[PDB]
Every structure is written in C-alpha cells, then in structure tokens.
Amino acid sequence: WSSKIDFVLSVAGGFVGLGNVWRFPYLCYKNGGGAFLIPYFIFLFGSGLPVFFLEIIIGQYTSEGGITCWEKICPLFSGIGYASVVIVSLLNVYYIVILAWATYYLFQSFQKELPWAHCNHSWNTPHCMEDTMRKNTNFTSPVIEFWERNVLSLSPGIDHPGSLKWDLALCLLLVWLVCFFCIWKGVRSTGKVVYFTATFPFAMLLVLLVRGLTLPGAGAGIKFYLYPDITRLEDPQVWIDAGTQIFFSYAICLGAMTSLGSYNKYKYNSYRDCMLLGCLNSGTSFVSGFAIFSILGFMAQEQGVDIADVAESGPGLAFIAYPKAVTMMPLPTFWSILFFIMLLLLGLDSQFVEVEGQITSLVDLYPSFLRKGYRREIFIAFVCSISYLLGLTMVTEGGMYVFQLFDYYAASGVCLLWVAFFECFVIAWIYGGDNLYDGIEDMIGYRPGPWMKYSWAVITPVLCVGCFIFSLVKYVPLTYNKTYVYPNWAIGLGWSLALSSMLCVPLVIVIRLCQTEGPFLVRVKYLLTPREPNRWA
Ligand SMILES: [Cl-]
C-alpha cells in the first residue's frame, strides 16, 4: 500500500526476463556450474551495478536519450550512442526468435499428452529410450529428440540451411505482428494488470524451484552448480560470458537504460533505486539457476549420464530442463501452458521496450522527414519487417547455428565490453569523476562513496581491457554444443557482426574531427567540451 510506491519502481521492470530464466542458466551450463559464478559476481559488484548507475545518471542529468546525451557529455565520443543503436538493432533480430520457439511450445501443449514425454512419435530416432527405462549404441532422451528433431529439425551444419520451418516461421510472424500491434498503438494495459504481469513470473518460478528441489538427486546438481572448478577459471571465455551475461541482464550498453533514466526527475534519489533493481535482478538469476541445475541433477541421476552431458550446452537448456520438470508435476499440461505463457509474457515485455526504444531513437535521429512529413507508422511496420526477414535465417533447419552466432556476437562478446569501457573512460577520464559527483550531489541529495568513482575510473576499464587481451591471446573458436566446429566464414561473419557495432565510435570520431576546422588541438578542445549537460535544470 503506502510502501508499494517503492515497489512501484519495481513495477517498472528490470528485475526478471529472458536473460535470467533462459540465457543465464545456459551460459552457466556451457561454462561449468560453479566456475561461472565467481566472474559473474566480480562483474556484478565491479562493473554491472556501476555501469547501470552511470547510465541512469547520464540519462537523468542530461535529460536526453542514448544518442543526444553524449552530444552534451562528450561530443567527440558521440558514436557510443550510435553503436548502441546498432546493438539494439541486432538484438531485436534474434531476441524475438526465442519467443517463436516458446510460441511453438505453447502450440504443442494444447493436447492430451505432452509431445516431449515419449519416444513413440514420428520424429524420434530408433535409439530413443524413455528416461524411466534409461538405466535398464548411445541413447537420446525423448525431450532432447523433440527439441532437436521436431522444434528445430537441426541440420548437420550452418552451411546446410535446408528449408524454412513453416511452423516456426508462422510463429515468428505471429509474434512480430503482436509486437507491431502493441507498438503501432502502444496498448499497455497497466492499471491492475501490471500486478499480474509482474507477479506471475515469480509465482511460476517459485513452483519450478520447489519441484526441482523436491526431485531426487538434486543434491548432485546443486553441488555441480555451486562448487567452482579453479582451473576452468583460466579460460577467458568464462569471464567474457559472465560479463556479457551481466550486461545483457541489466540491458546496459544498449542505450535503453539512459532513455529510461531520462524520464526520472532531476531531483530524484536514483542511487538506491538502481542498486535495488540490480540486486533484485541478480537474485532472480541466482534463484532461477537453482531450479534448472536441480532438474539437471535429477535428469543425470535418472538417466545415469553425467551432469555436464545430460542436456544441451548451447541455447535451449530452458527448453530441455523445464519441459522435463513439467512432466513430473501433476497435470503437466496446465503447468506447461502456464510456464510457456510466462516465457511469452517476459519475452514480449522485454521486446516491446527494446523495439520501442530503437524506434524512438531512430525517429529522433532525424524527425524532419521521418516522422513529420511521412507517416510515422510506415517506419514502425518497415523496421520490424527488416527485423523479421533477418530472423528467417534462424527459422531454417540450420538456423540454430545462426542464432548461436548472433547470441555470441550480435549483442554480446567484445561489443558490450567495448561500449562499457568507452562509456567508463569518457565519464571518468574526460568528463571527470568529481565533476559528475558534483551533479549527483544535487540530483540525489548526498555524495556517493568512492565505489562508483573507482569502478568507473579503474575497475571496469581494467576488466574490459584484460578480457579483450586474454580472449585475443587465448582465442577459443565458438562451438555449438561443444561438438560442432564453425567454419572460418561463419566466424568471420560473427566478427563482422561484432565490428558493425564496435566501429561506430572510431568512425564517428573521424567524422567529427574531419568536419571541424583548425589545428588538431583546437578541434580536440572543441569536441571534448561538454555542451551544458544540465541545461535542463
Ligand atoms: Cl543474470
């Protein structure tokens, strides 16, 4: 009631999504259970929360979105905004594809028996034994066979596109139509409906966690998830994956948080409200990991296979562990329907915000003719179409590898670290930590501690440079389910996708330097001078 106003901030969002229920457990399973947690917490307490708070501060202080805020903070490094516009452009290409998969599952759960519960279907290989009789050449679980042969129909490689999955294509088209109709009119129920749309995911996750814990053999899965392997920390990929998972969950380095914080009033205590949201999101990820890694332990106990070889290392872990746990609950159809409705709600809640922010940024880029002369709706329908067609490369039979490439490069990997390092360097060494603290004192009412200052100045750039150096020196090529080796051209395409956003900052720097006149020192003096960031106040 009276205190719910604070919870009203939590009603905004940013505490639950597909980056906690889907991406975090799959990344943890790929990079080992316990060894993934230490870099995750290091990036959470050293770079994640500081960068989130910094983006909120920039948005509130400059009262501008992703692009225009850097025009007042440091014009020379304005391309940091543009890179974000690229990243959010790539994410919307593939982040919605997951929904399609879930949508397909939501269409497969409307029958008497779940299709992923028996081997007696037409999409099952001859070597398919039910998990109950698994313990009595190699045998495959019916859930994995349903995921790989019916939902995906996986191809031998990325160079085998095959044909378009008509069911998956129809589901993706339906999801895109829903997004367009929810953006072309901006139909957000809010009211009391937001209560349900915010409490249902936690209600379902609590039941999932209870079911996972009650499953026999979950102790081994929990031990695998918690106890870290020290040697696995030597691989830089664990650190990169943890940092990029933190950034993906916090939606930072995309310009969305700056735009969201621009709505906040100048005299607003956002320091506490950003730490609360970050802690809630991290706790949600940590708790949701326990359910999946207990289901994995139960599956490993019942099948007899190892915990690390019982599911898919790559994407789709949430489509193997959760559907398997659903078949254990009484009346599995109802629980499967609820779980996939929750997944659809979370995905749509994230996608609406991301696509609307991208459209707003692109309209504000040049509204003279994009939204004034020409009808704005024409831009809404077109962009999604461009995002829809580019998604059809992940609808084909061999589209899972393309989705993995996008998930590893388009909105993760070195691009997010690059953007975070540039933001922190611009704020701490160009704008100045004390200069920003002076504004923060007026914005929130008190001077923050040295944690944010030393994270922006030292910790985050050091982490984002060490990650680059160690990932380049110890270069491990990307693999799918630790069995498939991508071709050289696929790796080149992924690196080109990363560079499409990485090169925005240097190109904008070059353009800005070239458009100016005079000796180089005069140009660098003009372009590094803030353009009255707090003119709005
Ligand atoms: Cl997370």
UniProtKB/Swiss-Prot annotation:
Name of the protein in question: Sodium- and chloride-dependent taurine transporter
Similarity comment: family membership: Belongs to the sodium:neurotransmitter symporter (SNF) (TC 2.A.22) family. SLC6A6 subfamily.
Residues passing through the membrane, by range: 7-27, 35-54, 79-99, 166-184, 193-210, 246-263, 275-296, 329-348, 378-396, 413-433, 454-473, 493-511
Record entry for activity regulation: Taurine transport activity is stimulated by thyrotropin. Taurine transport activity is inhibited by GABA, hypotaurine and beta-alanine.
Membrane topology: Multi-pass membrane protein
UniProt KW keywords: Cardiomyopathy, Cell membrane, Disease variant, Glycoprotein, Membrane, Neurotransmitter transport, Phosphoprotein, Symport, Transmembrane, Transmembrane helix, Transport
Gene: SLC6A6
GO cellular component assignments: apical plasma membrane; basolateral plasma membrane; cell projection; dendrite; GABA-ergic synapse; membrane; microvillus membrane; neuronal cell body
Tissue expression as described in the entry: Expressed abundantly in placenta and skeletal muscle, at intermediate levels in heart, brain, lung, kidney and pancreas and at low levels in liver.
Disease tied to this entry: Hypotaurinemic retinal degeneration and cardiomyopathy: An autosomal recessive disorder characterized by low plasma taurine, childhood-onset progressive retinal degeneration, and cardiomyopathy.
